[PDB]
Design a protein around this ligand. Sequence first.
Ligand SMILES: *[C@@H]1O[C@H](CO)[C@@H](O)[C@H](O)[C@H]1NC(C)=O
Ligand SMILES: *[C@@H]1O[C@H](CO)[C@@H](O)[C@H](O)[C@H]1NC(C)=O
Ligand SMILES: *[C@@H]1O[C@H](CO)[C@@H](O)[C@H](O)[C@H]1NC(C)=O
Ligand SMILES: *[C@@H]1O[C@H](CO)[C@@H](O)[C@H](O)[C@H]1NC(C)=O
Ligand SMILES: *[C@@H]1O[C@H](CO)[C@@H](O)[C@H](O)[C@H]1NC(C)=O
Ligand SMILES: *[C@@H]1O[C@H](CO)[C@@H](O)[C@H](O)[C@H]1NC(C)=O
Lengths: 325, 113, 49, 49
Amino acid sequence: MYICGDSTECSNLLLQYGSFCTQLNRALTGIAVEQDKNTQEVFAQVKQIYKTPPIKDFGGFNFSQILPDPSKPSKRSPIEDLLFNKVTDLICAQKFNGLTVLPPLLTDEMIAQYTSALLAGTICSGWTFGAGPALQIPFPMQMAYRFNGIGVTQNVLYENQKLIANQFNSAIGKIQDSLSSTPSALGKLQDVVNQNAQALNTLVKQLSSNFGAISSVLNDILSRLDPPEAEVQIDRLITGRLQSLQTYVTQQLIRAAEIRASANLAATKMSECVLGQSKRVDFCGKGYHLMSFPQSAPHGVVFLHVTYVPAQEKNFTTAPAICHD
Amino acid sequence: GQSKRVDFCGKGYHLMSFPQSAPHGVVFLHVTYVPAQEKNFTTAPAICHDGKAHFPREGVFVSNGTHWFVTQRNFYEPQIITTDNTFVSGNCDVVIGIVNNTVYDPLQPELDS
Amino acid sequence: SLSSTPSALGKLQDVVNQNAQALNTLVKQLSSNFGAISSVLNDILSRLD
Amino acid sequence: SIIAYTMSLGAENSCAYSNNSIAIPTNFTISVTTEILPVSMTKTSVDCT
Ligand SMILES: *[C@@H]1O[C@H](CO)[C@@H](O)[C@H](O)[C@H]1NC(C)=O
Ligand SMILES: *[C@@H]1O[C@H](CO)[C@@H](O)[C@H](O)[C@H]1NC(C)=O
Ligand SMILES: *[C@@H]1O[C@H](CO)[C@@H](O)[C@H](O)[C@H]1NC(C)=O
Ligand SMILES: *[C@@H]1O[C@H](CO)[C@@H](O)[C@H](O)[C@H]1NC(C)=O
Ligand SMILES: *[C@@H]1O[C@H](CO)[C@@H](O)[C@H](O)[C@H]1NC(C)=O
Ligand SMILES: *[C@@H]1O[C@H](CO)[C@@H](O)[C@H](O)[C@H]1NC(C)=O
């Protein structure tokens, strides 16, 4: 339809070429399949679905901006709701020229459920659910283990439990406000969307090019010319349109490869920072990694990384060893 | 080597792996451990003894009903809470949920013998 | 498990299958006119000046 | 017959979040899993002429 807009004569001329349309269809089908696979690899890592506990008091820890809001039509956390609101007739014009869009296999609600299950898992059992059965651990003890994991005795946590919970709760509130006020915060996801839209708009736009033909419209060529003259003019338009689609697909394949790399990275981060604790420097936030919480977003994933940073410090004298006797 | 990256070398805790060849590729056999039977115990962050607060050095304080012990985090092998299993820092007033118990001093019987 | 599951090695089988298709397409693409009177150079040369 | 359905996302499961309650493993199971990756593809060459 893109090339031969319901023209029998165009179709017959198109058939003088090899299996051009078949290859384009295979390339685009292959991309569409990968897009659903990427989503599943990033989010469906744990097939056990845990409910968010009803007890909203984790030893002084809040998490209400992270956990889903039960009062809404879509069970999104306050942060997720913000992310969805921030990232954003032509669709008909594209449809009428043979350009369409397929639905994703997983819906936003399904993604939210996976995200919530992972959060419920982490808050209730720390990392144990990610490597075997989920073992409940009082939340402050999960933190104690995470502290030992960065070289700080658990004694610090218990002595400072109230301070830590308060600093934590404040940090989460700050993120939601930061995302709300910063116009570029989600630019990465917006850019993906913008590129896809432009590529399709280019294909529609090039239908108007003549490519050496007397006109861009097959119906005008056919209403004014006889068969052999029309065939010459039609072939000029076919060549141009074949080139347009071929160009589109090649670029679309390259962009898909970039996205697979991003998706693979995201999947790695979830496996290592959400379902674990990571010692890799700057892998999951600056500072020492303690834990992470995923949030969903249009076409992507947003991670909240909880880390520690040393603060006030003092100048002390030191020595390699003590000489006793 | 032995990787600590979660799920990198397969699900569960990674111990070791063995490669096998294949046409155009490689197949890995990853040996991992998964916790199996488990039990629910009562717990506490610390033990209050002589007014000082005792934290386990390498484990978790576990209540078996009427008695407290220390186990390694990944396996239920109860130890007697002794002064060699804990460290002391801070008093019994700060830690939230601290419970009163006895910390055994291993030197005492030698002082008496 | 490997013996019994036919899909177990699909990740390797797919590489092989994709490359086979890429070559089969090149061979099949030879049988095209592209606006020419025939797909065969020898027929074009045999009958035309 | 062909049946249409909403897919299941995972098994329903649960845990008891509870302060002062902890689970500790008493036994273990050793398991071995298989991971498959391609390394190379057939090296081909096409003579243009
Ligand atoms: C979280 O903070 C909000 C205020 O921003 C408060 O209304 C809510 O009760 C707190 N929830 C928890 C679990 O602390
Ligand atoms: C302490 O460290 C700071 C740099 O952070 C340095 O400027 C200062 O002179 C040092 N003071 C002493 C007494 O060594
Ligand atoms: C656990 O409690 C029982 C009493 O219910 C007691 O007889 C048993 O000795 C305790 N376990 C250990 C390891 O001492
Ligand atoms: C644990 O939860 C109970 C719920 O009845 C509460 O009374 C208690 O203060 C909480 N904290 C500790 C350390 O036991
Ligand atoms: C520990 O012993 C002291 C003795 O003065 C008592 O006041 C306190 O209530 C006891 N704590 C617990 C948890 O039994
Ligand atoms: C103890 O574990 C069992 C599963 O073996 C679970 O059904 C039960 O609810 C748990 N009890 C508590 C207090 O967590």
